Symmetry: D2
Subunit: 482 residues, 4 copies
Amino acid sequence: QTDVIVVGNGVLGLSVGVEIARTRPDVRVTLLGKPARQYGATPAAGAMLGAFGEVTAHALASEHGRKKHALAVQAQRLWPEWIESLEATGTAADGRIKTADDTVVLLNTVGHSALDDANFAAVLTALKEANAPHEEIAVESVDWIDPDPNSRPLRALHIEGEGSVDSGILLAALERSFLQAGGRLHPVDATEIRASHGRVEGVVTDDGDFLPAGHVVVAAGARSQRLVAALPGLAHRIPRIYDGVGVSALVDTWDGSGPATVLRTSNRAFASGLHLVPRAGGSVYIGATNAVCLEPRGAASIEETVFLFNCATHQLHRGLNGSELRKVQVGSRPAPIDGFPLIGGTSVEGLWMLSGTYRDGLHMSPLLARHVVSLMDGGTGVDGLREFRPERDLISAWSREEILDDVVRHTMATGYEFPWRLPLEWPHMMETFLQGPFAELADRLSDTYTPPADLMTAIMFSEREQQDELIAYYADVHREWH
Amino acid sequence: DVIVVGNGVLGLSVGVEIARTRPDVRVTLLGKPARQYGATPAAGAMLGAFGEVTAHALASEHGRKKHALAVQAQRLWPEWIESLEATGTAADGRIKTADDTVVLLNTVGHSALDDANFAAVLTALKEANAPHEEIAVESVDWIDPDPNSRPLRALHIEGEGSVDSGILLAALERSFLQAGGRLHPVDATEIRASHGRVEGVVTDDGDFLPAGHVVVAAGARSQRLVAALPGLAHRIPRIYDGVGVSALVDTWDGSGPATVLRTSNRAFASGLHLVPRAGGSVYIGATNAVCLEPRGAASIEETVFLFNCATHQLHRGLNGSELRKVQVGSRPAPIDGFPLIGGTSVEGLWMLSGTYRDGLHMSPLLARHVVSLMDGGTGVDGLREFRPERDLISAWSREEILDDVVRHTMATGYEFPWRLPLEWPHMMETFLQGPFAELADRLSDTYTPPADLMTAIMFSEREQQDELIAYYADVHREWH
Amino acid sequence: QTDVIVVGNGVLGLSVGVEIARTRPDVRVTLLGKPARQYGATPAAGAMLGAFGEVTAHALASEHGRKKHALAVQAQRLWPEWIESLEATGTAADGRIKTADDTVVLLNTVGHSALDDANFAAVLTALKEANAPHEEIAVESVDWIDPDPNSRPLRALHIEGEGSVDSGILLAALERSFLQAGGRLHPVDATEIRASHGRVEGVVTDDGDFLPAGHVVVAAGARSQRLVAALPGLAHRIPRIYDGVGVSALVDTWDGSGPATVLRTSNRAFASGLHLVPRAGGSVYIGATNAVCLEPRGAASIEETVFLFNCATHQLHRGLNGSELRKVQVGSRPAPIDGFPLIGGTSVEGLWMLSGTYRDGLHMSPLLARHVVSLMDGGTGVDGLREFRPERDLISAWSREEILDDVVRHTMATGYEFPWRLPLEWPHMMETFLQGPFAELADRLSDTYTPPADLMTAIMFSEREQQDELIAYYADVHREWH
Amino acid sequence: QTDVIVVGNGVLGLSVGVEIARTRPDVRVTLLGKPARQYGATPAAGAMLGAFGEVTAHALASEHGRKKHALAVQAQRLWPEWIESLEATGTAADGRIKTADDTVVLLNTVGHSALDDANFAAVLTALKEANAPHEEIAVESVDWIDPDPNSRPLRALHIEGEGSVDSGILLAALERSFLQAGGRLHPVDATEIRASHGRVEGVVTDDGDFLPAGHVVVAAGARSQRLVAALPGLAHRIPRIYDGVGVSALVDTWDGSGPATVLRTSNRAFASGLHLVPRAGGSVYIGATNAVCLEPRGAASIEETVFLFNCATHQLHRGLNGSELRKVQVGSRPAPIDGFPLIGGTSVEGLWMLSGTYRDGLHMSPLLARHVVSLMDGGTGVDGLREFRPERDLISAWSREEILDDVVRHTMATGYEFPWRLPLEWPHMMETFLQGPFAELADRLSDTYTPPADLMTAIMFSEREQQDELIAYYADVHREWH
Ligand SMILES: Cc1cc2nc3c(=O)[nH]c(=O)nc-3n(C[C@H](O)[C@H](O)[C@H](O)COP(=O)(O)OP(=O)(O)OC[C@H]3O[C@@H](n4cnc5c(N)ncnc54)[C@H](O)[C@@H]3O)c2cc1C
Ligand SMILES: Cc1cc2nc3c(=O)[nH]c(=O)nc-3n(C[C@H](O)[C@H](O)[C@H](O)COP(=O)(O)OP(=O)(O)OC[C@H]3O[C@@H](n4cnc5c(N)ncnc54)[C@H](O)[C@@H]3O)c2cc1C
């Protein structure tokens, strides 16, 4: 037997683990990661099986964005049989993975017209282009919702067959399915990947042990690039992944009710958004904030909890105000510096990566897992994932001008989403005075690379030393690839 | 001899029609250039038929009849304007200021009014086979709202436009004089009648003017003038002052929209609209408060609310624009919610009043109706329920009005817009129901005032409530 | 038996347990209660040693209020030697009970003038009458605070020798001191007090056991009256105690700093308030909401968490916005139906109660513990606590008119404290329409008893069946005592 | 000729006209100006006799500011006898000039701490230094006011003998007193001052006439510099005066009541402020906005009317909300480009100026009139007016750094005064991004001159062509004086 080590116990690590263990009787597969799931994105997720719900005008204006969207639409088709195959290893008492079949997208005025109006139109267009079943519906026909009238939706979009899963029941089902197929769970973290003669030898663990392997799959979420970056040359050949720190909450509803569908807005300032995912047992999930952090953070800020709760109680259901808080959850969306995932092989024989999936790795997991396992078996996996190979020059999916327009719009959107109340001249004054500093920052960081808006705002408000370290990083990447 | 009492749109419109149709008779029109409490000069004005539609109005038979008359009036306006402009020159300016209207739906209001009323307007347009289109908000020209106050739906109504009310008044006066009418700039103090017939009018300079016909179109003063005649105090429904505040603004860049911009009718028959004017001016309107006594000056509250709504919901550029005039006028507000149009039990005594928000729009139809009746005709088919000598109409159940007055009260909050703890609205709804139910039960066993008047009565002095209880009891005695 | 059983493991149970064990070395004292401390007030407390800080105009306008205040002033004097005696049983690593020596009371406009202006004046007058060391200080001289300018204080009052304790370190010190003095901890709950021939026999526990005793001291917080009410006649002779559900939070500050003093407002709508209590290790405590509930609740509502966080970030320090949330805490202030504590003996020989202390049982604990132990030893304990004996007709400390004025003012204060933004006619309209329903409720409940504002609002918005049950309760109490 | 022509019929022109006519009975004094008083500051004034009420920390931090304040304190002493001398020419039935004897300054939180807190402390210090009678009073003792509780004052300062006049009754009394003393009113405007051989010959009027004179006193408000600048060399020797456009209103109060004192805040963003001046007959005056405009404007903007009304109804009396609006008034405060008035003689014999008095020309009028008449008679007038001579290099009363700090604080104050509601990170973000653009503008305008904050904000948001014209102006002034 030829040993495979999967580093990471989120949706991506476990999904690849399950696929390898089921497909490869010739391999012993060991999966690393602790039950604490420190900084874990997956346990903090609702989660929405978001393909069309995730559409933004800005994403679909780039070739790379359209390619990512096509993969999300393909992933949706795999979910019914994937769920069936995971539930089959359990019993009724393990609970149901699927919590909703459909999604309603709501349009209210608690946000920027330049994001919410543009994104609602882009979602409609993407659905029509895909010939996907959907209907614009009367807001009056949306069941369950009880918004503040001043925060109410005036348009609503029903998307058929775009639903949600319980992320906790999914994780439990993946672990159980992994064990059933002969996989071994080793509850320790990788400290170091060992390689020599251009080949992986295995992994040093944080209990001081060494585990030998012919294949190492890195699916360590936001830690994935930092782990691989220690190997020779790879610090400037694997795009950096940061922590997209997200806050969500589990609430026991006042009357034990919940909506029959996912309820969501389109993506909002700096890839945040508002949604409610149904759960069993009189619980609802509400999400979810997003802030790119240059270092990991495992606790919610006061600001994040207040913003999430204020949005949900005003825009979705005022009944949530009197509902009991059961849990505040925090996890790190793996946020790639060039805005696209890191999926496939490396220049190191037997070294694979599955990371940088940001807001929709959980949704894409069955497709991504099958792609990487096909590559490991000498196949070509899924068409169109070649552009997202982990060992690459940074992608430039947008012009600097497009990103500078976007970062100012997203900054203004943090105001409109609050929502603020300002003198009417103040917004245009702030727009005018935001342009110059962001243009200056972009010019200073690099002659060739521009970070997307989500990362550019984090860099703008970081320490001088952190900005200078990123200037050096971008210059070493340019040197490596040009 | 014919005497028209009142120099608003209704008095002058009937004056012009009489003078043009009866060249053998002397027609004299009373009223002063000051136009004290005058509704017409304070109007934009919108030729609002479909724009005026509410779910609540169209749920009553009387409301559907009023709406049918508004739709009929629209058809008369192009030829009416042509006939008034024909008596003038290019230099008098144009009566028509816009051909079309855009209705905007934003969330700066109550869902129970704005969502219901937008759906009712759409249905009314489709039922009437009126040309209209739901349009993308992005395609509405000129507007620059606060994003948190922006519309998410917009409705283009073709051939529903606006007039300059000042140029209309000047054109009516000029057309009246051209047709042989006489303007006598004094007020009527008293209508003289004996042996069941009008003799004429005593004026406030002490003179007596004889007449075979007296047409009362004195706006909110109309019923008080006729109520002095024997028996008529409890046979002519009372008319109150629907005090409205509007403003003329010189825009920062001299621009204006090509269409009327408006919301549907809001709390207590207020609303937000912009009517285009010539010369880099726009009209913004308009507040509404039923007052048991007349008021000729704007409150601070009314000016701030009108300006706040226009700058946030229509165009932030209006914030830096110059205020040219704050206008105040009294919408004639009938106690039973419907106009007073036609003849009386007194031979030669006619009334044209109680038109509230849309007398100006209905004026050519109403003028032609009353002139047809004066000539022995039957005028316009659907006006019979709105005869001025009547028992008070009960167009809605007490329950419907109690639901409406609580919704309108809550709408004053959502329209501000307020920011409150989330439990407060349901708490206020619960504690508003009892007092309004108690007031309604106390006022009368049979009559219920509509929401606009019920809120004014709720917050009036005990003595004013008791006087209204006596009024309602004397009306019941008279008609039952 | 000369055995003593203390029922409850909060500050009051443990404080009386320690005093009994130290003063009666020949007797076995057993203390009941579980480490979970379900609904526990003490673990959720900051806690402030609040005497002058707790002063309201409304409390000091009643004879009973002035008597309660005199006891709080007396309790303050006991704290230095009490803390010394508790720390003496531990070592350096157990940490310090005292976290601050002084308090600053802040006056801002994020509240009702009828509460905050009246209460600030009452605190000043109480300090001057007691000849207590204090100073009105310039707001600019208050260290650490960084309020939103629109939420800033314009007056500030320094109170010397009014400080705070770490409630967690206090509980650990009381348990350790109890063991050191020969006390036994039995981690089970009392289900039933056994009595016959007018005398306590002991306690049935929830593991089915029977523990014999000559003395039973009930300090079970908000459960105290429900436990004793099962004994013959006592349902209408021991005033009911409800749950004053309070939400607080532990925050790790952005820079590890904290204030050197307690920072607080005066008591606000329905005995809520805003305060920050210093803690060791770069943590601060923020508190604290209050809602009287007719049934217990062990979880924070969304509303409570948002209100607490919004007040602290605007009125105390905007830096708390970016600070990490470590814990949301929930506990039940024991809320007596007649507004005064239940301290002393009963008509049942050997049955004692220490409860109904609402906002300041922790502060009064050393005085209350010494009072009850003196009574148990045949003394008269502390002068002025005989009015607060647990077996009594309901106190009527205020006229019905005073309470109706108070409940409308407190209702309006929930608006001003938010703070709301309303059309200027709405407040007077709401005041006018609130008076009638509260007058009607008060008249319907009883001809003789009026619940204080905090309880009256809970009864106003309770189910018809709960109102009717309270009407019957008040009628059975009147029958028993008249 | 020994004939005197006064150009201007505001408080300054009429005050100097009265003093000349009374002191020189042997000479013909003619006063020009029309009853419309186009752009007139005086008729739009309340007016407050503001000396201590006008104190700001920023003004008193400069030597020129302390000199201006000393003149305001000296002017206050003249008012009782000045009023007596004007009322003596009339009867009871002419009405009373004085409408209040005293002023209450209110401190609320509807503003920037960096202006309102600093200015309240500066007012207190200035009063103590001048030995002026005053008292800090309980807010509860301020009669009449009925603020929104969230907008209420927490501190109040009673200033004795700092009152108000009815500006309309003052103008009528000055005209009557002028005629009584032999003055002639000629209701036309001056178009041109004629001078040759370094001496005034007289004035061309806008009806084409020529009026000869040995003395011409220019008190034409904001038109005063434009009139004199036409004479040879004077275009860069007389500092420019702009229009400080101010909006005020007359309101008939709901019940005919008014306060017994002036009610005011200290000066606020860009020399705006909130005040109520009592009037006879159930009327109150409310003021007053301020905006420096590079061209005159005779109509109120929507923004100005809403801001004035919102502040008065929330911060002074909610009863004003239901009160009737009688008149919106607009006048131009003469706003000198270097921040100080233009008072005294010129290089042209017999040519005098009284202008650039901004917020307190009306208050200073009796002192300024006496100063100019003393100079015309060969005296030295009032001590300390020498720096404010009209023919001068632009004053630099503050460092560029002081003005840049001030303009950012005033910009932020437009937010806090609204008052806005924003996410807590936004204010520091806006402060950071406002500094650079104002620093850049200041550096670009001139190497030596810096406009005060009120003018700098108007220049920042003016057209490029208007900025360039001001750069040229500053360079021509530097050339003339260096
Ligand atoms: C703010 C506002 C906005 C409006 N907007 C619109 C709009 O968009 N569309 C629309 O269709 N309509 C609008 N209206 C007007 C509405 O249609 C009215 O119902 C209509 O204008 C009433 O006309 P009237 O001639 O009956 O009354 P008025 O216009 O009030 O004319 C009555 C006249 O009679 C005079 N008078 C009083 N007593 C006497 C007496 N004793 N003798 C002689 N004369 C006397 C008065 O001084 C007055 O000039 C608006 C009104 C207001 C106040
Ligand atoms: C948010 C908040 C903030 C506060 N802040 C302050 C402050 O700043 N200053 C101050 O002085 N005080 C403060 N307090 C506390 C206040 O003084 C309380 O009145 C006091 O803590 C009550 O103590 P207790 O021991 O009576 O009750 P608790 O602390 O409730 O203890 C009772 C214990 O008995 C247990 N129990 C219940 N039933 C049984 C049973 N059948 N058998 C055995 N055990 C049982 C419970 O689980 C619980 O642990 C605060 C409280 C809250 C909720």
